[PDB]
Design a protein around this nucleic acid. Structure first.
Lengths: 99, 99
DNA sequence: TACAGTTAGGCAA
DNA sequence: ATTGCCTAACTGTAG
DNA sequence: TACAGTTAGGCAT
DNA sequence: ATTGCCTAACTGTAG
């Protein structure tokens, strides 16, 4: 229905859009980490294209793409985005305005 | 032989000491993330006790415990610790001296 | 070093 | 099995 | 805003 | 399927 492949070489992981809280960059070259309800998945991708898939995926920071549908709350004073699963990331200066 | 349980509630994950590159803190309360060769595992634990399990686990930062056995290289000028799997973390001011 | 700012994990739910 | 509020202990930076 | 420092992802392997 | 080197675009901070 709303599926995405997270490409991983020797397999792929497939997930639904709204299974994902957010994505962030890994320390491994050209890898991201998809944050799901209570698993994190290492995979090959670019933040840019993922934010261009759907309006709910908002590139809130150079290093983070958040799913609007899974925001639990937002401290826009500290610029922390809270998710349903109690993870959080940060919205940059430039992007917090437009969430 | 050298096994550790990563307690996760509705299951546990068990791993060998040297399967683990390093541990870091999650954004989820009282959870850590174990970094294995190419998976990251969310679990309930404290950095302190893990560094006390074995000398190879060195608490190199408030937020990181590294496995000495899986260090690939160390930039002690930038204070970045590189691991066999091409992840890296940072050694704090206080701890980089003693690795 | 000592200082203004951040956080791991205790305590309660 | 999970979640927040708190503070003792850490963190990076300048003098 | 404009500035000194950091990084996502292109290009090569 | 993986890894490093590079730079255009981001990042936080002070004036």
């Amino acid at each position: 229905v709303e599926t995405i492949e997270l490409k991983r070489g020797s397999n792929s992981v497939y997930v639904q859009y709204d299974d994902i809280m957010f994505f962030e960059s890994s320390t491994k070259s050209h890898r991201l980490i998809a944050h799901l309800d209570n698993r994190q998945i290492e995979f090959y991708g670019n933040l840019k294209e993922l934010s261009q898939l759907d309006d709910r995926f908002f590139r809130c920071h150079n290093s983070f793409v958040v799913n609007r549908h899974n925001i639990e709350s937002i401290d826009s004073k500290e610029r922390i985005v809270y998710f349903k699963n109690k993870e959080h990331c940060y919205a940059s200066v430039r992007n917090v305005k437009k969430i």
